[PDB]
Design a protein around this nucleic acid. Structure first.
Ligand SMILES: Nc1nc2c(ncn2[C@H]2C[C@H](O)[C@@H](COP(=O)(O)NP(=O)(O)OP(=O)(O)O)O2)c(=O)[nH]1
Ligand SMILES: [K+]
Ligand SMILES: [Mg+2]
Ligand SMILES: [Mg+2]
Ligand SMILES: [Mg+2]
Length: 331
DNA sequence: CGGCTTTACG
DNA sequence: CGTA
DNA sequence: GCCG
Protein backbone atom coordinates (compact mmCIF):
# COMPACT_ATOMS: atom_id res chain seq x y z
CA UNK A 1 0.00 0.00 0.00
CA UNK A 2 1.06 3.59 -0.70
CA UNK A 3 0.42 5.04 2.78
CA UNK A 4 2.34 4.01 5.90
CA UNK A 5 -0.92 3.84 7.86
CA UNK A 6 -2.09 1.05 5.51
CA UNK A 7 0.63 -1.37 6.49
CA UNK A 8 2.07 -2.76 9.72
CA UNK A 9 5.55 -1.42 10.42
CA UNK A 10 7.33 -3.27 13.23
CA UNK A 11 10.15 -1.83 15.33
CA UNK A 12 12.73 -4.30 13.99
CA UNK A 13 12.73 -5.62 10.44
CA UNK A 14 14.70 -7.17 7.59
CA UNK A 15 16.21 -4.16 5.78
CA UNK A 16 17.91 -2.26 8.59
CA UNK A 17 21.00 -1.22 6.64
CA UNK A 18 19.01 -0.01 3.64
CA UNK A 19 16.57 1.99 5.76
CA UNK A 20 19.41 3.53 7.78
CA UNK A 21 21.06 4.80 4.59
CA UNK A 22 17.88 6.38 3.25
CA UNK A 23 17.22 8.00 6.61
CA UNK A 24 20.65 9.64 6.51
CA UNK A 25 19.65 11.22 3.20
CA UNK A 26 16.25 12.22 4.66
CA UNK A 27 17.90 13.95 7.62
CA UNK A 28 20.43 15.71 5.39
CA UNK A 29 17.61 16.89 3.12
CA UNK A 30 15.95 18.44 6.17
CA UNK A 31 19.18 20.21 7.10
CA UNK A 32 19.19 21.81 3.63
CA UNK A 33 15.56 22.92 3.89
CA UNK A 34 14.25 20.31 1.44
CA UNK A 35 11.25 19.04 3.37
CA UNK A 36 9.78 17.36 0.29
CA UNK A 37 12.94 15.32 -0.22
CA UNK A 38 13.07 14.50 3.49
CA UNK A 39 9.48 13.17 3.30
CA UNK A 40 10.16 11.00 0.24
CA UNK A 41 13.34 9.48 1.69
CA UNK A 42 11.52 8.85 4.98
CA UNK A 43 8.65 7.18 3.11
CA UNK A 44 11.03 5.05 1.06
CA UNK A 45 12.82 3.99 4.22
CA UNK A 46 9.52 3.10 5.86
CA UNK A 47 8.48 0.95 2.89
CA UNK A 48 11.58 -1.18 3.45
CA UNK A 49 10.77 -1.45 7.16
CA UNK A 50 7.37 -2.91 6.20
CA UNK A 51 8.76 -5.60 3.87
CA UNK A 52 8.47 -9.24 5.02
CA UNK A 53 12.06 -10.18 4.08
CA UNK A 54 15.39 -8.64 2.93
CA UNK A 55 15.80 -6.87 -0.38
CA UNK A 56 18.70 -8.65 -2.08
CA UNK A 57 18.10 -7.71 -5.74
CA UNK A 58 17.05 -4.51 -7.50
CA UNK A 59 14.01 -6.18 -9.08
CA UNK A 60 12.39 -6.41 -5.65
CA UNK A 61 12.06 -2.60 -5.71
CA UNK A 62 9.79 -2.73 -8.76
CA UNK A 63 6.26 -1.74 -7.80
CA UNK A 64 7.25 -0.39 -4.38
CA UNK A 65 5.74 3.05 -3.72
CA UNK A 66 8.13 5.99 -3.23
CA UNK A 67 11.07 4.21 -4.91
CA UNK A 68 12.17 6.33 -7.85
CA UNK A 69 15.50 6.80 -9.55
CA UNK A 70 17.32 8.31 -6.58
CA UNK A 71 16.20 5.95 -3.81
CA UNK A 72 16.65 2.95 -6.11
CA UNK A 73 20.21 4.03 -6.97
CA UNK A 74 21.09 4.21 -3.26
CA UNK A 75 19.77 0.70 -2.66
CA UNK A 76 21.50 -0.52 -5.84
CA UNK A 77 24.91 0.69 -4.64
CA UNK A 78 24.42 -0.79 -1.18
CA UNK A 79 23.53 -4.16 -2.71
CA UNK A 80 26.41 -4.05 -5.18
CA UNK A 81 29.17 -2.56 -3.00
CA UNK A 82 28.05 -2.46 0.64
CA UNK A 83 28.22 1.36 0.71
CA UNK A 84 26.56 4.24 -1.08
CA UNK A 85 29.06 6.94 -1.96
CA UNK A 86 26.51 9.75 -1.63
CA UNK A 87 25.53 8.55 1.85
CA UNK A 88 29.15 8.33 3.01
CA UNK A 89 29.86 11.79 1.59
CA UNK A 90 27.01 13.14 3.72
CA UNK A 91 28.18 11.23 6.83
CA UNK A 92 31.67 12.73 6.82
CA UNK A 93 30.70 16.25 5.74
CA UNK A 94 31.23 19.08 8.21
CA UNK A 95 27.83 20.55 7.32
CA UNK A 96 25.96 17.34 8.15
CA UNK A 97 27.88 16.64 11.36
CA UNK A 98 27.46 20.18 12.70
CA UNK A 99 23.78 20.46 11.75
CA UNK A 100 23.14 17.11 13.45
CA UNK A 101 24.97 18.30 16.56
CA UNK A 102 23.10 21.61 16.73
CA UNK A 103 19.59 20.39 15.83
CA UNK A 104 19.72 17.74 18.54
CA UNK A 105 19.97 20.45 21.21
CA UNK A 106 16.69 21.08 23.02
CA UNK A 107 15.49 24.46 21.79
CA UNK A 108 17.36 24.43 18.45
CA UNK A 109 15.67 23.77 15.12
CA UNK A 110 17.03 23.62 11.57
CA UNK A 111 16.72 27.38 11.05
CA UNK A 112 18.69 28.25 14.19
CA UNK A 113 21.28 25.52 13.49
CA UNK A 114 21.70 26.78 9.93
CA UNK A 115 22.12 30.40 11.06
CA UNK A 116 24.76 29.38 13.62
CA UNK A 117 26.53 27.32 10.95
CA UNK A 118 26.52 30.26 8.53
CA UNK A 119 27.90 32.44 11.34
CA UNK A 120 30.86 30.04 11.57
CA UNK A 121 29.87 28.28 14.80
CA UNK A 122 30.77 24.60 14.98
CA UNK A 123 30.91 23.23 18.56
CA UNK A 124 28.80 23.27 21.71
CA UNK A 125 31.57 25.34 23.30
CA UNK A 126 31.18 27.98 20.58
CA UNK A 127 27.53 28.22 21.60
CA UNK A 128 28.39 28.40 25.31
CA UNK A 129 30.85 31.26 24.70
CA UNK A 130 27.92 33.61 23.90
CA UNK A 131 25.25 32.76 26.49
CA UNK A 132 23.59 36.16 25.98
CA UNK A 133 22.37 34.95 22.57
CA UNK A 134 20.69 31.77 23.88
CA UNK A 135 17.06 31.42 24.88
CA UNK A 136 16.33 29.95 28.30
CA UNK A 137 15.24 26.74 26.57
CA UNK A 138 18.52 26.56 24.65
CA UNK A 139 20.45 27.27 27.86
CA UNK A 140 18.69 24.31 29.47
CA UNK A 141 19.36 22.12 26.44
CA UNK A 142 23.06 22.98 26.53
CA UNK A 143 23.33 22.68 30.31
CA UNK A 144 21.98 19.13 30.18
CA UNK A 145 23.23 18.15 26.73
CA UNK A 146 25.36 15.18 27.81
CA UNK A 147 22.52 13.58 29.78
CA UNK A 148 19.95 14.39 27.12
CA UNK A 149 22.23 12.68 24.57
CA UNK A 150 22.24 9.49 26.66
CA UNK A 151 19.54 7.00 25.57
CA UNK A 152 16.57 6.80 27.93
CA UNK A 153 16.09 3.16 28.94
CA UNK A 154 13.01 1.16 29.90
CA UNK A 155 14.14 1.13 33.53
CA UNK A 156 14.21 4.94 33.44
CA UNK A 157 10.72 4.93 31.94
CA UNK A 158 9.40 2.70 34.71
CA UNK A 159 10.94 4.92 37.40
CA UNK A 160 9.60 8.12 35.84
CA UNK A 161 6.16 6.60 35.35
CA UNK A 162 6.01 5.89 39.06
CA UNK A 163 6.95 9.43 40.08
CA UNK A 164 4.52 10.96 37.54
CA UNK A 165 1.73 8.60 38.62
CA UNK A 166 2.40 9.53 42.24
CA UNK A 167 2.34 13.27 41.54
CA UNK A 168 -0.74 13.10 39.31
CA UNK A 169 -2.56 11.03 41.91
CA UNK A 170 -1.62 13.59 44.55
CA UNK A 171 -2.88 16.43 42.34
CA UNK A 172 -6.20 14.99 41.18
CA UNK A 173 -8.08 12.00 42.59
CA UNK A 174 -9.11 9.67 39.80
CA UNK A 175 -6.66 10.98 37.21
CA UNK A 176 -4.92 8.42 34.99
CA UNK A 177 -1.48 8.38 33.39
CA UNK A 178 -0.80 6.62 30.08
CA UNK A 179 2.67 6.06 28.63
CA UNK A 180 2.69 7.27 25.03
CA UNK A 181 5.33 8.17 22.43
CA UNK A 182 8.01 5.77 21.31
CA UNK A 183 7.97 3.58 24.40
CA UNK A 184 4.31 2.77 23.81
CA UNK A 185 5.36 1.55 20.35
CA UNK A 186 7.70 -0.92 22.02
CA UNK A 187 10.99 0.98 21.74
CA UNK A 188 13.61 -0.14 24.24
CA UNK A 189 15.40 3.23 24.17
CA UNK A 190 14.35 6.77 23.39
CA UNK A 191 15.12 10.49 23.66
CA UNK A 192 12.42 11.31 26.24
CA UNK A 193 9.35 9.90 27.99
CA UNK A 194 5.86 11.05 26.95
CA UNK A 195 2.85 10.79 29.28
CA UNK A 196 -0.82 11.45 28.51
CA UNK A 197 -3.05 12.37 31.47
CA UNK A 198 -6.83 12.42 31.73
CA UNK A 199 -9.76 12.05 34.14
CA UNK A 200 -12.97 10.04 33.56
CA UNK A 201 -15.20 13.06 34.39
CA UNK A 202 -15.05 15.59 31.55
CA UNK A 203 -13.73 18.93 32.75
CA UNK A 204 -12.15 17.68 35.96
CA UNK A 205 -8.75 17.52 34.21
CA UNK A 206 -8.73 21.33 33.81
CA UNK A 207 -6.05 23.16 35.78
CA UNK A 208 -4.05 20.00 36.56
CA UNK A 209 -0.41 20.64 35.50
CA UNK A 210 0.33 23.57 37.92
CA UNK A 211 -0.66 21.24 40.77
CA UNK A 212 1.38 18.38 39.31
CA UNK A 213 4.43 20.56 38.69
CA UNK A 214 4.38 22.11 42.17
CA UNK A 215 4.39 18.66 43.75
CA UNK A 216 7.24 17.56 41.50
CA UNK A 217 9.19 20.78 42.18
CA UNK A 218 8.85 20.32 45.95
CA UNK A 219 10.59 16.97 45.55
CA UNK A 220 13.40 18.78 43.72
CA UNK A 221 12.75 16.72 40.60
CA UNK A 222 12.27 19.50 38.05
CA UNK A 223 15.34 20.99 36.38
CA UNK A 224 13.36 22.77 33.64
CA UNK A 225 9.74 23.11 32.72
CA UNK A 226 7.81 25.02 30.08
CA UNK A 227 4.04 25.12 30.54
CA UNK A 228 1.48 25.68 27.77
CA UNK A 229 -2.10 26.51 28.82
CA UNK A 230 -5.14 24.88 27.25
CA UNK A 231 -11.04 22.18 22.75
CA UNK A 232 -8.15 22.75 20.33
CA UNK A 233 -5.12 23.01 22.65
CA UNK A 234 -4.21 20.62 25.45
CA UNK A 235 -2.48 21.74 28.62
CA UNK A 236 1.13 20.59 28.07
CA UNK A 237 4.44 20.78 29.99
CA UNK A 238 7.84 20.09 28.42
CA UNK A 239 10.12 19.19 31.30
CA UNK A 240 13.60 18.09 32.23
CA UNK A 241 13.46 15.78 35.24
CA UNK A 242 16.24 14.99 37.66
CA UNK A 243 16.18 11.18 37.74
CA UNK A 244 17.96 9.47 40.65
CA UNK A 245 20.59 6.87 39.76
CA UNK A 246 22.89 4.78 41.99
CA UNK A 247 24.97 7.38 43.82
CA UNK A 248 24.10 10.16 41.37
CA UNK A 249 21.40 11.30 38.92
CA UNK A 250 20.78 12.16 35.28
CA UNK A 251 18.57 14.66 33.49
CA UNK A 252 15.73 13.17 31.39
CA UNK A 253 13.32 14.99 29.07
CA UNK A 254 9.67 14.28 30.02
CA UNK A 255 6.58 15.56 28.19
CA UNK A 256 3.24 15.79 29.97
CA UNK A 257 -0.03 16.34 28.09
CA UNK A 258 -3.51 16.57 29.62
CA UNK A 259 -6.58 15.79 27.53
CA UNK A 260 -10.28 15.76 28.40
CA UNK A 261 -11.51 12.20 28.26
CA UNK A 262 -13.74 12.99 25.25
CA UNK A 263 -10.57 13.66 23.21
CA UNK A 264 -8.31 11.05 24.84
CA UNK A 265 -8.38 8.59 21.86
CA UNK A 266 -7.28 11.35 19.49
CA UNK A 267 -4.57 12.55 21.88
CA UNK A 268 -3.30 9.01 22.40
CA UNK A 269 -3.27 8.31 18.66
CA UNK A 270 -1.42 11.55 17.95
CA UNK A 271 1.10 11.29 20.76
CA UNK A 272 1.88 7.62 20.12
CA UNK A 273 3.36 8.32 16.71
CA UNK A 274 5.57 7.57 15.01
CA UNK A 275 5.91 11.06 13.53
CA UNK A 276 5.87 9.61 10.01
CA UNK A 277 2.94 7.31 10.85
CA UNK A 278 1.01 10.34 12.11
CA UNK A 279 1.79 12.38 8.99
CA UNK A 280 0.80 9.49 6.74
CA UNK A 281 -2.42 8.82 8.67
CA UNK A 282 -3.44 12.48 8.55
CA UNK A 283 -2.59 12.72 4.85
CA UNK A 284 -4.69 9.60 4.20
CA UNK A 285 -7.63 10.96 6.19
CA UNK A 286 -7.73 14.24 4.27
CA UNK A 287 -6.80 13.09 0.76
CA UNK A 288 -8.48 9.66 0.65
CA UNK A 289 -11.44 10.11 3.05
CA UNK A 290 -12.03 13.87 3.02
CA UNK A 291 -11.83 14.02 6.82
CA UNK A 292 -9.51 16.25 8.85
CA UNK A 293 -7.58 14.48 11.61
CA UNK A 294 -5.51 16.05 14.37
CA UNK A 295 -4.68 15.28 17.98
CA UNK A 296 -8.08 16.63 19.12
CA UNK A 297 -10.55 15.00 16.77
CA UNK A 298 -11.69 13.95 13.32
CA UNK A 299 -13.73 16.56 11.44
CA UNK A 300 -16.17 16.04 8.56
CA UNK A 301 -16.06 19.41 6.73
CA UNK A 302 -19.18 18.63 4.69
CA UNK A 303 -21.44 17.79 7.64
CA UNK A 304 -19.45 20.19 9.88
CA UNK A 305 -19.31 17.56 12.64
CA UNK A 306 -16.67 15.87 14.80
CA UNK A 307 -16.56 12.09 15.15
CA UNK A 308 -16.93 11.00 18.75
CA UNK A 309 -14.41 8.22 19.28
CA UNK A 310 -14.22 6.02 22.36
CA UNK A 311 -11.01 4.23 21.37
CA UNK A 312 -8.23 4.23 18.83
CA UNK A 313 -10.06 1.24 17.30
CA UNK A 314 -13.00 3.60 16.65
CA UNK A 315 -10.75 6.03 14.79
CA UNK A 316 -9.23 3.38 12.55
CA UNK A 317 -12.71 2.06 11.76
CA UNK A 318 -14.05 5.51 10.88
CA UNK A 319 -11.13 5.93 8.44
CA UNK A 320 -11.72 2.52 6.83
CA UNK A 321 -8.30 1.27 7.95
CA UNK A 322 -7.41 -2.04 9.53
CA UNK A 323 -6.40 -1.47 13.13
CA UNK A 324 -2.68 -1.23 13.85
CA UNK A 325 -1.52 -1.68 17.47
CA UNK A 326 1.17 0.82 18.57
CA UNK A 327 3.97 -1.72 17.97
CA UNK A 328 3.07 -1.71 14.26
CA UNK A 329 3.12 2.11 13.95
CA UNK A 330 6.92 2.29 13.76
CA UNK A 331 6.96 3.98 10.36
C1' DC B 1 2.90 22.46 -11.31
C1' DG B 2 0.80 21.53 -6.55
C1' DG B 3 1.31 18.93 -2.72
C1' DC B 4 3.75 17.24 1.22
C1' DT B 5 0.38 16.50 9.10
C1' DT B 6 -0.69 19.37 12.48
C1' DT B 7 -1.31 24.20 14.92
C1' DA B 8 -2.03 26.58 19.64
C1' DC B 9 1.05 28.40 22.82
C1' DG B 10 5.41 30.79 24.67
C1' DC C 1 11.70 31.49 16.32
C1' DG C 2 10.87 27.10 19.40
C1' DT C 3 7.96 23.05 21.65
C1' DA C 4 4.91 17.61 20.65
C1' DG D 1 12.02 13.03 -4.24
C1' DC D 2 8.24 11.31 -5.63
C1' DC D 3 3.10 11.31 -7.14
C1' DG D 4 -0.67 12.57 -10.20
N1 LIG E 1 1.98 17.52 15.31
C1 LIG E 1 3.20 17.00 15.52
N2 LIG E 1 3.31 15.87 16.21
C2 LIG E 1 4.60 15.47 16.34
C3 LIG E 1 5.72 16.11 15.86
N3 LIG E 1 6.86 15.38 16.20
C4 LIG E 1 6.40 14.34 16.87
N4 LIG E 1 5.04 14.35 16.98
C5 LIG E 1 4.21 13.35 17.63
C6 LIG E 1 4.50 11.94 17.13
C7 LIG E 1 5.53 11.45 18.14
O1 LIG E 1 5.54 10.03 18.24
C8 LIG E 1 4.98 12.05 19.42
C9 LIG E 1 5.97 12.16 20.55
O2 LIG E 1 7.07 12.99 20.13
P1 LIG E 1 8.57 12.61 20.50
O3 LIG E 1 8.53 12.43 21.97
O4 LIG E 1 9.37 13.76 19.98
N5 LIG E 1 8.99 11.26 19.68
P2 LIG E 1 8.89 9.66 20.03
O5 LIG E 1 8.33 9.40 21.38
O6 LIG E 1 8.28 8.90 18.90
O7 LIG E 1 10.41 9.17 20.04
P3 LIG E 1 11.68 9.66 20.90
O8 LIG E 1 11.16 10.46 22.01
O9 LIG E 1 12.37 8.43 21.36
O10 LIG E 1 12.52 10.47 19.98
O11 LIG E 1 4.50 13.35 19.03
C10 LIG E 1 5.60 17.32 15.14
O12 LIG E 1 6.49 18.01 14.64
N6 LIG E 1 4.26 17.71 15.01
K1 LIG F 1 16.09 20.36 18.74
MG1 LIG G 1 9.82 21.63 -5.43
MG1 LIG H 1 9.19 10.60 22.99
MG1 LIG I 1 8.31 14.03 23.58
Amino acid sequence: PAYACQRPTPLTHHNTGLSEALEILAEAAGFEGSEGRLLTFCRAASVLKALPSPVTTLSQLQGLPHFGEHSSRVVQELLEHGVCEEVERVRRSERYQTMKLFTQIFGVGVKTADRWYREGLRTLDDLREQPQKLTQQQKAGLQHHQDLSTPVLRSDVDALQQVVEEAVGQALPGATVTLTGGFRRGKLQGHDVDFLITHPKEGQEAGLLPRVMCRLQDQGLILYHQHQHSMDAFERSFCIFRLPQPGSWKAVRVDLVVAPVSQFPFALLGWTGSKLFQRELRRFSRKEKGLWLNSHGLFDPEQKTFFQAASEEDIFRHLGLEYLPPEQRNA
